[PDB]
């Protein structure tokens, strides 16, 4: 007798459990077991994520709801699950998306010096240099406290509470609320702060004393502070270190991209489809009976969307293995999610692997790792899968 398949399959980030394709083919939704003891349905093939993805009925906000089987433990308090739903209300959807574009004055030129900066450090100390720790998460860092329009010393210290705040855990976790309240009291100091003038703070800062958003909480304008800078540096920091890896393994597209960089855009989008940098699949709580496949998903059942089982998908990107850059469905992969709750920072999460890499391929045209790739430690029980240091040599 065997226990009933538990989630998730594996926390190494540089290849795909052959568990997927097997699952795909088989079993595209089925039952699973996750890390809190709870029952839920994924769901793999492209055709049956998108329908979930597609379908409100299928919500992210009562994934939240008391007694509802969970995928994890909630390291935010529970109406933050609907964040994007408190922002759309308070009518202050267009001003957020306004201010996370990558198309800012002189934002990706900060973007090109910052990523230009970190490297030379990196040179002048010598290999091996570890990517992660030192390049990737700065810059994700330094970009969010531009993007927000916080100074740039207060980013190192938002940054540590990352590591607990995007846990994938069975139960509550006290340093999570430790460092949630502290980082909401940071966000409330910079409203009241007059220096902050610039970026998205400033932008929330000046709409919190216009009449028309008077009754808006101060409880949701800084909430929108501390969601954007973390979910912005844990996903654009960790999408970039593993797109490093992918490409270090692929020495010949690597030559390609540093030979023509006018091919980076397409070759992140590639870096894009076939990353494995989201640890579970993405919750949503059915709030009717809804047919999925050869299944019957019932009112109030948990159903987990697994992105790499859509993006691998050899119905939909045939050899979903191999990075091809003239595909004729290029941007139609799931990497930044699809329907309501598709990614509203998209444009700057290109745009910061666009240029990362670029300024990597310049400075290190022979980047490789400095340890065999068995070497890197992948985080475990957290939402991303990523190296605890990435060494390299060139
Ligand atoms: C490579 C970069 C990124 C990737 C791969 C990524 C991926 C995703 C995915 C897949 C979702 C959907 C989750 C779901 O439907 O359950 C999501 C949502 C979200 N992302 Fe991104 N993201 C990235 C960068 C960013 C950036 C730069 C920001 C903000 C500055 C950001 C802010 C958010 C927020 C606030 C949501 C929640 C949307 C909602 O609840 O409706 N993301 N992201
Ligand atoms: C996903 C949902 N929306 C949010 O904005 C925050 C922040 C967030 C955004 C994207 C993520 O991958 C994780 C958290 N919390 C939520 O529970």
């Known amino acids: 007798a065997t226990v009933l398949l538990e989630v998730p399959f594996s926390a190494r980030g540089d290849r795909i459990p052959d568990a997927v394709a097997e699952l795909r083919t088989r079993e595209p939704i089925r039952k699973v077991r996750t890390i809190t003891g709870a029952e839920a349905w994924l769901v793999s093939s492209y055709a049956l994520c998108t329908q979930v993805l597609e379908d409100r009925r299928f919500s992210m906000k009562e994934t939240a709801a008391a007694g509802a089987p969970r995928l994890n433990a909630l390291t935010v308090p529970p109406e933050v699950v609907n964040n994007m739903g408190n922002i ?4 202050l959807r267009k001003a957020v998306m306004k201010a996370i574009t990558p198309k800012a004055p002189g934002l990706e030129q900060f973007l090109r010096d910052t ?18 720790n030192d390049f990737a998460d700065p810059l994700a860092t330094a970009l969010h406290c531009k ?3 916080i100074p740039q010393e207060d980013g190192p210290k938002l940054f540590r509470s990352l590591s607990i705040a995007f846990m994938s855990s069975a139960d509550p976790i006290p340093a999570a609320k430790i460092n949630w309240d502290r980082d909401i009291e940071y966000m409330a100091g910079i409203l009241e702060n007059p220096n902050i003038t610039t970026g998205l703070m400033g932008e929330l800062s000046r709409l919190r004393k216009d ?3 008077s009754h808006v909480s101060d409880e949701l304008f800084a909430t929108i502070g501390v969601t954007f800078f973390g979910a912005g540096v844990i996903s654009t920091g960790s999408f970039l270190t593993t ?7 692929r020495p010949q597209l690597r030559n390609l991209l540093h030979e023509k960089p006018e091919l980076i855009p397409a070759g992140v989008e ?7 940098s989201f640890a579970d699949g993405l919750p949503r709580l059915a709030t009717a009976d809804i047919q999925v496949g050869d299944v019957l998903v019932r009112k109030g059942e948990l159903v987990l969307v697994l992105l790499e089982g859509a993006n691998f998908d050899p119905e939909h990107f045939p ?9 004729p ?6 990497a930044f999610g699809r329907g309501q709750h598709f990614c509203p920072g998209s444009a700057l999460g290109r745009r910061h692997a666009q240029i990362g890499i670029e300024a990597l391929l310049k400075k290190m045209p022979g980047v490789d790792l400095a340890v065999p790739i068995d070497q890197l430690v992948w985080r475990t029980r957290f939402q991303r899968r990523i190296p605890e240091r990435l060494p390299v040599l060139w």
């Open 211 to 213: 009449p028309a958003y």
């Open 243 to 249: 797109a490093l890896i992918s490409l270090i393994q």
């Open 115 to 132: 990523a230009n900066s970190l490297l030379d450090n990196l040179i002048t100390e010598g290999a091996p240099a570890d990517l992660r």
């Open 329 to 334: 469905n290029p941007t139609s992969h799931l």
């Open 147 to 149: 993007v927000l329009g």
């Open 88 to 91: 759309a209300d308070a009518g």
């Open 319 to 327: 050899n979903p293995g191999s990075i091809e850059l003239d595909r």
């Open 270 to 276: 590639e870096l894009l489809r076939i990353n494995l």
